Amino acid sequence: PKLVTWMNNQRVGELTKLANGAHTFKYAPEWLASRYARPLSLSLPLQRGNITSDAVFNFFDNLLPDSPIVRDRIVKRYHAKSRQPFDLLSEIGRDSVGAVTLIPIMAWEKLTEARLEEVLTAYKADIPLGMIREENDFRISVAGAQEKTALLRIGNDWCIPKGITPTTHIIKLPIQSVDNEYYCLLLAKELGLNVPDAEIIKAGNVRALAVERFDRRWNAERTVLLRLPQEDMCQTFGLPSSVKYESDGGPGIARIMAFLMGSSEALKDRYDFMKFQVFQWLIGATQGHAKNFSVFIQAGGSYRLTPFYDIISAFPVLGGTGIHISDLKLAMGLNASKGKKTAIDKIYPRHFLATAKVLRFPEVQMHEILSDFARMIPAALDNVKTSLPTDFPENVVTAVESNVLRLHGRLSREY
Ligand SMILES: Nc1ncnc2c1ncn2[C@@H]1O[C@H](COP(=O)(O)OP(=O)(O)OP(=O)(O)O)[C@@H](O)[C@H]1O
Ligand SMILES: [Mg+2]
Ligand SMILES: [Mg+2]
């Protein structure tokens, strides 16, 4: 049938699946006439009538977990009509990344430590996104291939939101990734990068990562929780999650930098994006694909980059399973004298400078970024280390700082 699409308390339009299986979307005239109307996606510009392009199917598919296995679980959990996005979202689309609420204001159930552990380990019983069969009003969806869930934090209590109430945190579970990401987010923050705050939460013998959502915002008085429109780069370019990597045809640095020229914060966003490329290289982050970058869609359809997220270093995984440093590749390659430069172990300042030059990113700014990491990295690693718990896995810290300092040496010798 039909899924009515809401942005907070406003009707945006409807998603329908035709008798031919095609996914179509139509904006409500009331939405189109609203003062600050904005599109669901920059790939789905405001217009009247049914939109039938592949961009519709892809946009909504990108709201679901990437893994075909996780999708199998959802189907089995809610006896979904099929595996298509419309049918899976009919079941779990009330709360997803961004502000799209799909249904065919503030209510919740507080969780006890015992119940919290139940949700956080439900995946062991083939439960998708911690949506235990016990509940029936816990419908959430979150993209990405890593096992996770999402919860509502009210004060210092964890809660399962009911109906259309939003979640406030994305909870990532162990597939040592929890400690890895925790460390990387702290290092990012220490270096002045825009990333969300996160904390390691405990529930029995379970250790998960609770990441504060930047697609959610409480009003000043903390009485109402709103969702903020947001989409990832696959969505913004109308592409399927299957091509998130540049090697599979997804957007690279050049395409995203050109797209950011249209940002309401273009110069800042371009600078921050290039800075983050140098950061990913330094920490051996190999999964900076298109779905790991997003933009907020603002009133009137303007857009701006969101904070960076899903930051994992490959360094702690080296050697243990035979992966060598020479095997680490940036998801989005840099310019090389000939072709591209992708090997973290072979990249130097010259590659960032050559890339900036061809992309019209000021050379002075690129030097600034490189020189800033050259003098700040040592102190940043130390400061983070001192901020880590005492039970934090020392091997993670060792693997990351030794490998970061090794690459950092390349910057300090130049700057
Ligand atoms: N703090 C946040 N606030 C808002 N949205 C977020 C936040 N962190 C992640 N997201 C969104 O949720 C998705 C899943 O998170 P994340 O990228 O961290 O997952 P993964 O690490 O599960 O992903 P992958 O599939 O690459 O392994 C992202 O693609 C992004 O759209
Ligand atoms: Mg991701
Ligand atoms: Mg990831």
UniProtKB/Swiss-Prot annotation:
Binding of ATP, residues: 143-148, 172, 212-214, 289-292, 309-310
Residue positions where Phosphoserine is found in the record: 141
CDD domains with a match to the protein in the record: HipA_Ec_like (cd17808)
Segments passing through the bilayer: none
Name by which UniProt lists this protein: Serine/threonine-protein kinase toxin HipA
Note: The hipA7 allele (G22S and D291A) as well as a P86L mutation have been identified in E.coli isolates from human patients with urinary tract infections, showing the mutations may be clinically relevant.
Family under the similarity heading: Belongs to the HipA Ser/Thr kinase family.
Residue numbers annotated as active site: 287
Phenotype of the disrupted gene, per the record: A hipA or a hipB-hipA operon deletion have no visible phenotype. Initially cells lacking hipA or the hipBA operon were thought not to produce persister cells at a high frequency; this was later shown to be a strain-specific phenotype. A hipA or a hipB-hipA operon deletion show decreased biofilm production in the absence of antibiotics.
An annotated GO cellular component: toxin-antitoxin complex
Gene: hipA
Classification lineage: Bacteria, Pseudomonadati, Pseudomonadota, Gammaproteobacteria, Enterobacterales
Assigned keywords, A-Z: Antibiotic resistance, ATP-binding, DNA-binding, Kinase, Nucleotide-binding, Phosphoprotein, Repressor, Serine/threonine-protein kinase, Toxin-antitoxin system, Transferase
DNA-binding region: 357-360
E.C. no: 2.7.11.1
Effect of residue 87 to N: Loss of toxicity, still confers high levels of persister cells. Decreased affinity for HipB-operator
Subunit organization: Forms a HipA(2)HipB(2) heterotetramer which can interact with a single operator on DNA. When 2 operators are present each HipB dimer contacts 1 HipA molecule, which are brought together by the DNA bend and dimerize, blocking the HipA active site and inactivating its toxic activity. Mutations present in allele hipA7 (G22S and D291A) decrease the affinity of HipA for HipB.
Protein's UniProt keywords contain Repressor: yes
PANTHER family (alphabetical): SERINE/THREONINE-PROTEIN KINASE TOXIN HIPA, SERINE_THREONINE-PROTEIN KINASE TOXIN HIPA
Catalysed reaction, written as an equation: L-seryl-[protein] + ATP = O-phospho-L-seryl-[protein] + ADP + H(+); L-threonyl-[protein] + ATP = O-phospho-L-threonyl-[protein] + ADP + H(+)
UniProt PTM comment: Autophosphorylates intermolecularly on Ser-141; phosphorylated form not seen to bind ATP and no longer has kinase activity.
